[PDB]
Design a protein around this ligand. Sequence first.
Ligand code: ADP
Ligand code: BR
Ligand code: MG
Length: 405
Amino acid sequence: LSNKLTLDKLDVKGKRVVMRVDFNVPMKNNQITNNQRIKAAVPSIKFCLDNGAKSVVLMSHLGRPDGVPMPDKYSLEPVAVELKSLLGKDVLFLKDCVGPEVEKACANPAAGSVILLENLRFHVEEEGKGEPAKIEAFRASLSKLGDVYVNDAFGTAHRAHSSMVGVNLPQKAGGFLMKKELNYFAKALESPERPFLAILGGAKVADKIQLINNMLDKVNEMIIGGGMAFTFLKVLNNMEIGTSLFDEEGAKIVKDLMSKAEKNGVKITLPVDFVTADKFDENAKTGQATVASGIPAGWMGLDCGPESSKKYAEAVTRAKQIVWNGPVGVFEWEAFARGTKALMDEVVKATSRGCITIIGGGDTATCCAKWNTEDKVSHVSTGGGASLELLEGKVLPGVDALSNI
Ligand SMILES: Nc1ncnc2c1ncn2[C@@H]1O[C@H](COP(=O)(O)OP(=O)(O)O)[C@@H](O)[C@H]1O
Ligand SMILES: [Br-]
Ligand SMILES: [Mg+2]
């Protein structure tokens, strides 16, 4: 951020600070399962308060409510409560993020007020799809909630959304988490140790399959696992995949990706076996499948199997540097957690013999919390797709929108 205003040089004394954070925390049975992303923004928030900010107004999305208010499923209210404990200051939660009543609560707050707005994506104008004059007015309304803007939302920095690129105030500063994450990656990605392995799993198939093309110019090996694999196996193996995650658009580029991997000497490791489920439920009935057998109609692959785990371990053993985003199964549910656990064990072992290991993402970082490996890998990042976009070599929209120095 040499070229960009950062919080360390932003005068906040007597200023209302409006701050985009990534508080898109994982949830389960209505409770936060990992407060990593909330803790990560505390240094910027504390800094503002300690240096005399009149207020800090915090704004984030949570999940993908698709521009419709969904307070029953995707409310940020629970975050406010967790933020109080972490901060040592109370936080006011507002039930919306714009305009008239929110604008009043933020216009002239009591000194030192911390305020958390409701889910930005309850409004279509944040993304805005899921409408030009209304997008302008959405952005104008957010711009009113402070005098200066800070973006500490590393995990969302790849998104050119209204709250990330559309705030119109004279001073737009990168926060300390943004700086910490960009600095770590700049160093780690400058001259990666080789072989450099990327591990891509998870469930955001439509988005993340589109990142593979550029990643293939940077890495020497790739594991394509979790939800990502089924699109590849259907196209390449003509495998029956039941109701497993499948991306129609990405299917159309799978063969081109494999050609480019061959051209670039990138070894691709796909799973060869699976733990299956009769429905998307923690208590689903379960089965086993292989690529040869296919997955039965109406069943889904929710974890890889033992032979896949062995192949993954073999790639990890070869690697001198690893970036991992996306669990290789539905590790939140114990019936589908073994593959991710096994891969985590191998990544920890790699770290202990000198592998540089970077694990990132809202959900993938939760694997580290779940198995107590946050201090047994080289770096745990608050960015998932955001990190993958850095690996591709892009400038992130949330960074690009900051004020030049
Ligand atoms: N085979 C699969 N089918 C469906 N979901 C999966 C599968 N494998 C992994 N997942 C899911 O991937 C989700 C995380 O993916 P993602 O959101 O892209 O990663 P992150 O939050 O680290 O960026 C987890 O919630 C996990 O349950
Ligand atoms: Br997606
Ligand atoms: Mg996620």
